[PDB]
């Protein structure tokens with residue numbers, strides 16, 4: 001059976017790390033908090049969860065996490081409002097997704113609410129690490145790895161679940177929203193139908209490093225991931241893609257690719273779909289978007305805004321796509337960006353507790 | 364830029380571990396030797412290579428190797444003959460493949476021959492761990508991982524290269540051929556020995572066992588191309604549609620891992636010059652037709668760990684397909700096995716063997 005949060009043991013740090021403080025530039029994932037969550041699994045089932053001081057992992061050289069990528073991760077944020085209250089954004093969805101990833105890699109199942117309570121207690125211990133300046137947050141990184149001391153490609157008989165925390169700064173410092181330019185080359189493929197692109201597995205990210213460097217050498221910020229002979233737009237780097245346009249039928253709509261296997265089911269992606277549907281001002285649909293559909297809409301002036309969504313960036317505008325050595329201008333910023341700014345404002349007000357919402361979970 | 368074997372640090376173990384051998388079946392890669400190789404990389408370059416006692420790794424919890432699969436591995440075997448001398452089978456090809464895997468993941472470059480010398484020195488220290496019994500050898504496992512204490516998906520500013528050794532040790536296999544499962548794709552990374560290509564295969568292997576099959580026959584594309592058998596390369600020995608007797612294996616188009624045993628079987632069969640030996644796409648349509656016409660002689664898998672693995676049944680589209688491999692000898696498999704063992708255990712001298 002699963003580990004219980006009621007069995008959670010707490011060991012406080014004797015050697016605290018020095019906090020950067022307000023004003024100092026926080027770089028994404030480079031600064032770590034004082035404590036971490038740790039829970040072991042073996043043949044006797046799950047062990048008791050422990051909050052221990054931030055320390056290195058001791059792994060056997062043959063650990064299946066290092067040889068056969070029996071690893072998965074999650075990413076969510078904890079936000080601190082002006083009245084010092086810390087809240088998590090739709091953590092249940094990350095727990096749901098984490099369990100789906102675990103099943104795909106034959107890693108041990110756990111109870112979603114027990115892990116959520118373990119993470120809640122961890123953030124509570126390191127509460128003073130959560131920043132409160134505009135746009136800042138505490139990035140939560142749960143990881144589940146196989147830890148079997150065997151070179152045989154099989155289901156691990158030993159595993160480890162750990163959670164580390166990182167205080168992160170504003171993605172758009174000062175509040176000014178800035179766009180990204182994308183490289184669209186069909187030679188590089190992120191995922192395939194029948195593959196594992198719809199799960200947050202470590203294996204899906206390592207191969208993207210070389211492609212991202214090629215995008216940077218070409219003058220772009222990120223990569224537009226194309227799929228199939230029809231060049232279907234799937235992801236923008238590690239973000240889901242959205243297009244706000246007047247469709248071929250003349251109806252104003254917000255479209256994002258459907259969950260067909262090559263798309264990672266983003267929490268922010270689902271939130272934008274839910275929010276747009278609640279307003280009921282325009283059509284909201286999940287449908288395949290191709291490069292030829294994009295080209296046709298751009299020359300006819302039908303495209304209003306194109307953007308990426310994800311925990312790190314929340315909502316990120318796209319102004320340029322380098323496709324077939326030609327620069328395609330996306331008029332996102334000239335159009336406000338009206339919808340992006342509305343999405344960002346509503347998300348900001350919900351996340352920092354200015355507006356009450358069922359999406360928030362208090363710590 | 365590369366680490367030098369001349370800069371090798373030796374520590375030597377105080378109180379050695381228990382050495383196995385015959386009697387006990389000995390399961391693959393669960394028993395380890397006394398020493399390991401360790402080399403560290405940072406922004407200023409590589410450090411000194413170390414042969415230190417077998418011990419656990421100490422990794423920062425944000426190590427890119429654990430979050431974004433910045434990891435790769437290799438697999439080669441060391442054999443001990445009757446003259447008690449240890450020899451590695453075509454290790455230069457493994458060094459070549461490792462450097463290609465490193466480049467694909469933006470991991471640090473190294474001199475292939477300096478690593479080979481460091482590995483030779485490691486096996487020389489643990490020379491008594493290499494078994495001499497029939498069908499046994501020492502499995503060499505080199506690994507290169509990203510090790511930067513950062514959560515950003517980027518080129519690592521830190522890395523760790525380590526090599527661990529394992530003393531390791533017939534019946535045909537049944538395969539499940541279901542198109543719904545994809546191992547690798549064109550434009551992907553299936554042609555590199557990266558950890559990421561292996562984790563997803565575990566569930567598929569369990570699904571094969573549920574349907575009564577021992578391993579997975581990986582299919583690709585609309586035309587259902589045969590690619591790999593589990594984590595082995597596939598070979599079909601048949602009388603082709605043109606009437607010529609041939610040995611065929613899928614070509615290196617991006618979805619096939621370029622195996623050393625695969626290349627060796629092609630090279631050996633090429634030298635014989637008795638039948639046609641080609642690298643060409645094999646489809647299920649071509650295989651189905653050939654089985655019903657009785658043209659298929661043998662089907663097998665190839666790999667360092669698995670050697671030459673016979674196939675007797677393929678379950679494709681809810682239909683059982685008997686592969687007459689064991690009823691045809693298996694003539695070619697037994698010939699490949701005897702010639703490989705002669706080269707490997709030093710009964711016959713070859714350019715393929717590297718003396719330790």
Ligand SMILES: *Cc1c(COP(=O)(O)O)cnc(C)c1O
Nearest residue numbers: 238239240264266267268310311
């Ligand atoms: C994490 C991720 C997303 C976005 O997910 P969020 O849960 O919204 O943070 C989108 N695409 C990919 C490929 C991702 O890895």
Ligand SMILES: *Cc1c(COP(=O)(O)O)cnc(C)c1O
Nearest residue numbers: 594595596620622623624666667
């Ligand atoms: C290791 C491996 C092989 C075989 O390679 P060898 O070098 O001959 O050991 C074949 N296919 C896959 C997927 C492999 O991982």
Ligand SMILES: CN[C@@H](CC(C)C)C(=O)O
Nearest residue numbers: 075205238312514515516
């Ligand atoms: C900037 N993006 C985060 C999460 C990705 C991998 C989904 C990171 O680099 O960890």
Ligand SMILES: CN[C@@H](CC(C)C)C(=O)O
Nearest residue numbers: 391536578593668669672
């Ligand atoms: C058929 N042989 C297995 C491996 C041995 C080590 C049990 C395989 O190739 O999967």
